[PDB]
Amino acid sequence: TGLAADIRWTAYGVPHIRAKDERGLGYGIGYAYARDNACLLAEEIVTARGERARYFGSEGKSSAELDNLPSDIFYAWLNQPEALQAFWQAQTPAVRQLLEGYAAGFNRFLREADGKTTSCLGQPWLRAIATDDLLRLTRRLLVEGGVGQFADALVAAAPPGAEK
């Protein structure tokens, strides 16, 4: 509540979001984004939640071309509840509000969607999102120049046995 946004779209579906505060601004963003890209965000959130294998099985890959199970192990490791909570606790009020509105706006579109611009309507992985999911995505992007590039390597890291 206390969530309101004015959205204008110009040519090519470019949104222009006006709001009186960060919560409302986020509300407008998440709504406009969902209209164009609900399925993409749902997929990437599944990845960043380490749930690809749950929905799609061990064959097949994330959009970053990692096998589902190794990708999941990496994101489960990266996005542990303690890591997300610490990240959240360190966020300014304005950022918390941006994210709170985004999630609410995205979820609003999901409640209303009739398939007009959403191809994955009805899929079990197309679900309401939380601010934590947005933190999952942020942290996934955060490590793209670091441990993210070593996701497979981290998964493969196991101690030696008896070998010569």
Binding site: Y27, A32, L40, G57, I73, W77, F87, L98, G146
Partner: protein
């Protein structure tokens, strides 16, 4: 990615100008999205952002335009561990045996039978971070292992950082806001403002190690190949602490490259070194910036930007839309000479014809000469001492150049490479008279759209990366969000496109509309003022609350 910021001393209007040409995926978690954000009175910013982020990542406001490119700075360090000789699950620091920590994660897997089962996986961790294995390079044997310390894991400042950038008034303000927070993970920042300042910042989160620690803390084998690696058996190789840094163990802002000029700054994913050659950036940590030879994109841009002629918006646009294959400038003249020296060698006939006829571009209507050139260059890249003039540190803009055809062994190897390239091109089922646009496409539903541009590694400023799918090359990344911003009196004038369009959903009206325009290279107004927005015959409005 490419970025050019032009200042008062070089722009045709005496004000700032920015070309933003980031090279990013066309799908997935890094797919750019256009939006304009306004809280009347205190925030008004427009550009494009990555999925899930309620901030603008690359954009402009009333007096400022900014963009980013991927830097060459290190954002992590590998640590080579010396293992306990009695236990390969323990490691030595200052000769003391420490146990590895274990963190297990449990993952649900959907089986053949449609049911879930639970997989448990153990992640081994050191004081530095998790262990990593690259079979045959970074093994975990009985003597050594490798851990990875990521500098951004503790960067809780990233979203605040872009929100702050979004609120920046001009270049000076932007610089203060980035240097204060140090929340940028892995990109350079380039900007221009209305007053005509041009800013380059290599301001990101980078592991800090005091200069005197490097020669003994580096792993000599791994630094040669540019992998950031440190000795993990010595506590003195911990990242250095400095109270001026926004985060413990990262490089303070004063120690990172910044260039503020009134002529120009540029970057195409090379280091800070030759951002502007009139003022080389030098003497930084190897974790930060090194004086390495620049890629052909940067070399191309510098060839267009050097001199004294004023730069117009149109000039910067055409640097992208020309689709010039700049790598051809270095090798094609000599390659054509070798072709003439081998007239009536049946194996070389079609290749030499194609290459001589070629417009040296990656345009839709560019001949098969481009395809021959690409396959040749892949082979040329792996020959030793084949340059007529190899890379010269004293002439970093003009070297390497030419083929050393006067050396008989080189001439033999180059001709062989051309024959090998030609054979491969001719094996593939390329129809006679087919053009580059016939091959490189973006699939939209059951349709295809021809895409201009070529791989950045061939010096095509308009960089497009594609992969073989059935009978075509499918675009997967490159030119994405384009913005070209100037500052005339009325308000910011922004021009560009989102190459792959706003929506990834095939059902959307905005799934391919900008992709059709990108094909034809027809850039559009990015409307920012209420006046611009209201003039738009397609204007739609919705107000929502809960």
């Amino acid at each position: 990615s490419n970025a050019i910021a032009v200042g008062s001393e070089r722009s045709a209007d005496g004000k700032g100008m920015l070309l933003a040409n980031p090279h990013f995926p066309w799908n997935g978690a890094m797919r750019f999205y256009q939006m304009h954000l306004t809280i009347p009175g205190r925030l008004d910013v427009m550009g494009a952002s990555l999925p899930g982020l309620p901030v603008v990542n690359i954009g402009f406001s009333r007096h400022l335009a900014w963009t980013h490119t991927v830097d060459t700075s290190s954002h992590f360090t590998l640590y080579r561990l010396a293992l306990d000789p009695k236990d390969p699950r323990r490691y030595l620091v200052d000769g003391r045996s420490l146990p590895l920590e274990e963190k297990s994660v449990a993952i649900e897997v959907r089986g053949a039978d449609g049911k879930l089962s639970r997989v448990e996986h153990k992640v081994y961790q050191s004081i530095y971070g998790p262990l990593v294995v690259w079979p045959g390079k970074l093994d975990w044997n009985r003597s050594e292992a490798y851990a990875l310390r990521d500098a951004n894991l503790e960067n809780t400042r990233v979203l605040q950082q872009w929100y702050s950038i979004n609120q920046a008034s001009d270049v000076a303000d932007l610089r203060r806001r980035v240097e204060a927070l140090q929340g940028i993970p892995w990109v350079n920042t380039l900007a221009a403002d209305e007053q005509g300042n041009a800013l380059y910042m290599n301001q990101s989160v980078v592991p800090y190690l005091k200069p005197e620690l490097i020669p003994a803390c580096a792993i000599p084998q791994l630094v040669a190949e540019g992998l950031p690696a440190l000795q993990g058996q010595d506590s003195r190789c911990a990242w250095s602490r400095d109270p001026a840094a926004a985060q413990a163990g990262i490089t303070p802002a004063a120690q990172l490259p910044v260039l503020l000029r009134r002529d120009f700054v540029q970057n195409s994913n090379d280091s800070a070194w030759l951002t502007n050659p009139a003022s080389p950036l030098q003497g930084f940590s190897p974790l930060v910036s090194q004086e390495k030879p620049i890629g052909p994109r940067a070399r191309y841009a510098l060839s267009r930007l050097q001199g004294k002629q004023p730069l117009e918006a149109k000039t910067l646009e055409e640097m992208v839309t020309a689709n010039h294959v700049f790598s051809a400038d270095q090798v094609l003249p000599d390659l054509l000479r070798l072709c003439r020296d081998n007239q009536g060698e049946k194996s070389l006939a079609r290749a030499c014809a194609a290459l001589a006829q070629w417009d040296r571009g990656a345009n839709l209507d560019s001949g098969s000469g481009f395809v021959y050139f690409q396959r040749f260059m892949q082979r040329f890249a792996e020959l030793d001492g084949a340059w007529k003039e190899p890379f010269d540190a004293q002439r970093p803009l003009d070297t390497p150049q030419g083929i050393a055809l006067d050396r008989p062994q080189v001439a033999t190897q180059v001709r062989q490479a051309l024959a090998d390239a030609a054979a491969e091109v001719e094996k593939s089922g390329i129809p006679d008279g087919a053009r580059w646009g016939d091959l490189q496409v973006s699939t939209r539903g059951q349709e295809r759209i021809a895409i201009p541009g070529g791989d950045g590694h061939f010096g095509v400023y308009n960089a497009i990366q594609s992969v073989r799918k059935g009978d075509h090359l499918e675009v997967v990344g490159g030119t994405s969000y384009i913005q070209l911003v100037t500052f005339p009196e009325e308000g910011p004038k922004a021009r560009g496109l989102l190459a792959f369009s706003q929506s990834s959903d095939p059902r959307s009206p905005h799934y391919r509309d900008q992709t059709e325009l990108f094909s034809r290279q027809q850039w559009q107004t990015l409307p920012f003022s209420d006046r611009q927005i209201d003039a738009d015959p397609q204007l739609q409005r919705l107000s929502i609350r809960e």
